[PDB]
């Protein structure tokens, strides 16, 4: 069983890799369309070190009300994936959207690392 930190990396980190086919390929290769087409997801194109560093940056309230969320001081290169209308499982179709925004992640554990991607502002 992968750790919460490992799950975050799998679901949201892509420091290496875009095209309009990006989300269609990534959502599948990262196993986010295994038992269901995940409605939306975001990939971060920054180093693991830079994203992990966000846990010591701006503390803000999480969407669920918890207080362990942090916003990045600098904007980050990200890719937003949003499922289309004519998607329909098992052929999950996604709309790929690149953007540069600040990210908000929830952190926990020892070491204190990102475990949930809360939002992009």
UniProtKB/Swiss-Prot annotation:
Enzyme class: lyase
Location(s) in or outside the cell: Secreted
Known catalytic reactions: an [RNA] containing cytidine + H2O = an [RNA]-3'-cytidine-3'-phosphate + a 5'-hydroxy-ribonucleotide-3'-[RNA]; an [RNA] containing uridine + H2O = an [RNA]-3'-uridine-3'-phosphate + a 5'-hydroxy-ribonucleotide-3'-[RNA]
GO terms under biological process: defense response to Gram-positive bacterium
Glycosylation sites recorded in the entry for this protein: 1, 7, 31, 34, 38
Domain of life: Eukaryota
Gene Ontology CC annotations of this record: extracellular region
Cysteine disulfide links: 23-81, 37-92, 55-107, 62-69
Active site: 12 (proton acceptor), 116 (proton donor)
Effect caused by changing residue 116 to A: Loss of activity
Keyword match Transcription regulation: no
Alphabetic keyword roster: Disulfide bond, Endonuclease, Glycation, Glycoprotein, Hydrolase, Lyase, Nuclease, Secreted, Signal
The keyword Iron is annotated on this UniProt entry: no
Binding-site residues, substrate: 7, 10, 38-42, 63, 82
Quaternary state and interactors: Interacts with and forms tight 1:1 complexes with RNH1. Dimerization of two such complexes may occur. Interaction with RNH1 inhibits this protein. Monomer.
Reported function: Endonuclease that catalyzes the cleavage of RNA on the 3' side of pyrimidine nucleotides. Acts on single-stranded and double-stranded RNA.
Record-given protein name: Ribonuclease pancreatic
Species name: Bos taurus (Bovine)
Portion of the full sequence shown: 27 to 150 of 150
């Amino acid at each position: 069983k992968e750790t919460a930190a490992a799950k975050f990396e799998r679901q949201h980190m892509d420091s290496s890799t875009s095209s309009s086919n990006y989300c269609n390929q990534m959502m599948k290769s990262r196993n986010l369309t295994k038992d269901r087409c995940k409605p939306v997801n975001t990939f971060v194109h920054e180093s693991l070190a830079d994203v992990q560093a966000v846990c010591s940056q701006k503390n803000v309230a999480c969407k669920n009300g918890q207080t362990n969320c942090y916003q990045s001081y600098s904007t980050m290169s990200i890719t937003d994936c949003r499922e289309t209308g004519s998607s329909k499982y098992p052929n999950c179709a996604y709309k790929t959207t690149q953007a540069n925004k600040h990210i908000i992640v929830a952190c926990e554990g020892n070491p204190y690392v990102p475990v949930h991607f809360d939002a992009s502002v």
